[PDB]
Enzyme design. Structure first.
Site, PDB file in Angstrom:
ATOM      1  N   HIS A   7      25.304  17.759  17.098  1.00 14.87           N
ATOM      2  CA  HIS A   7      24.701  18.289  15.845  1.00 14.87           C
ATOM      3  C   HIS A   7      25.693  19.184  15.098  1.00 14.87           C
ATOM      4  CE1 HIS A   7      20.904  16.934  17.742  1.00 14.87           C
ATOM      5  NE2 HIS A   7      20.646  16.605  16.463  1.00 14.87           N
ATOM      6  N   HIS A  53      21.331  19.007   6.407  1.00 15.93           N
ATOM      7  CA  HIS A  53      20.028  18.761   7.079  1.00 15.93           C
ATOM      8  C   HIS A  53      19.992  19.399   8.477  1.00 15.93           C
ATOM      9  CE1 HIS A  53      21.906  15.572   9.418  1.00 15.93           C
ATOM     10  NE2 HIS A  53      20.799  15.535  10.153  1.00 15.93           N
TER      11      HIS A  53
END
Ligand SMILES: Cc1nc2ccccc2nc1OCc1nc(-c2ccccc2)cn1C
Ligand SMILES: [Mg+2]
Ligand SMILES: [Zn+2]
Length: 313
Positions: free
Chosen positions: A68, A106
């Protein structure tokens, strides 16, 4: 203003394809992102000095976690770019501006743990946001960076357009909470099959953009097999660290997150492709036909996971 970004020839061609990999050279990712905004939105969408300062503040607020990370942000945005270039005429000028920024932003300041582990850890962010914990945090980090001086890329929007673009980004970022994905696709499925799906209903557009965000977020499953396989190593590296942290709190993690169950990975991917990926890219192709390559590539990689189970790799 007359300063066009270009890429070398192989990237200039490969970047338009859905399965493009942005490559291992970090310093080229900002230029790739800027390239995609110019072609997708126009050279007149963002003041360039502001855009560059926004990109680099966004990069600084991604953490050095195995999956991530900054590279995931740019990948998810590249997929969105491909969708928008292959469905040019279906999207407003505000949607094209908002959605690539939505994708870059995001997962801002992700620590590599699920919403679930935040609640079982009793992290302060779980007190501040009871559901879609990380996703509300990510939108909140986007607003923060937008309010740093010199960083408001939306400066030239009206009061009202500004509010529409921040609303598109909010919903777009929330939609990356996979717990919300299942309901959202079921509804899109039924609305398309009964013929009620209508792209002038703003609440219908919202669901469509929500599906595209899931598709872009999972786009690891739509790459060349060696990109898909090697990305999975990074994905499990986070899951197993979270698994370890569950055990530290005195909780048996689910097998997905238990590193003692590496062996079952191929079957776990099968489950994921059948329960989530295939259905996601299936419903998306029905609604936006030119996205078919995402579905065809996903089906190929499923067949590659089947091959792993059969001991052929
Ligand atoms: C969530 C998830 N998100 C993904 C996002 C992008 C790409 C691949 C992804 N795979 C995922 O999940 C993979 C999985 N492994 C297992 C599993 C693994 C080992 C033992 C037992 C179970 C189950 N399940 C669902
Ligand atoms: Mg996320
Ligand atoms: Zn993501």
């Amino acid at each position: 203003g007359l300063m066009q970004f270009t890429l070398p020839v192989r990237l200039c061609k490969e970047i338009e394809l859905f399965h493009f990999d942005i490559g291992p050279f970090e310093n080229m990712w900002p230029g790739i992102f800027v390239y995609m905004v110019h072609r997708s939105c126009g050279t007149s969408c963002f003041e360039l000095e502001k855009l560059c300062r926004f990109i680099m503040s966004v990069k600084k607020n991604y953490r050095r976690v195995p999956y991530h990370n900054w590279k995931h942000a740019v990948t998810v945005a590249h997929c969105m770019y491909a969708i928008l270039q292959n469905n040019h005429t279906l999207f407003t000028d505000l949607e094209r501006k908002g959605l690539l920024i939505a994708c870059l932003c995001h997962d801002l300041d992700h620590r590599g743990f699920s919403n679930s582990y935040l609640q079982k850890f009793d992290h302060p962010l779980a007190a501040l946001y009871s559901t879609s914990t990380m996703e509300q945090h990510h939108f909140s980090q986007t607003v923060s960076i937008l309010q740093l001086e010199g960083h408001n890329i939306f400066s030239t929007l009206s009061s009202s357009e500004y509010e529409q673009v921040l609303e598109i980004i909010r919903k777009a970022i929330i939609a990356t909470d996979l717990a919300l994905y299942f309901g959202n696709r079921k509804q899109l499925e039924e609305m398309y099959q009964t013929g009620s799906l209508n792209l002038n209903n703003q609440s219908h557009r919202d669901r469509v953009i929500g599906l595209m965000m899931t598709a872009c977020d999972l786009c690891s499953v739509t790459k060349l097999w060696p990109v898909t396989k090697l990305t999975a190593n990074d994905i499990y590296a986070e899951f197993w660290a979270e698994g370890d942290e569950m055990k530290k709190l005195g909780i048996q993690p689910i097998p997905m997150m238990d590193r003692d169950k590496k062996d079952e990975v191929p079957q776990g991917q099968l489950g994921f492709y059948n329960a989530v990926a295939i259905p996601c890219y299936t419903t998306l192709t029905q609604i936006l036909p030119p996205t078919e390559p995402l579905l065809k590539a996903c089906r190929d990689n499923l067949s590659q996971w089947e091959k792993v189970i059969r001991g052929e790799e």
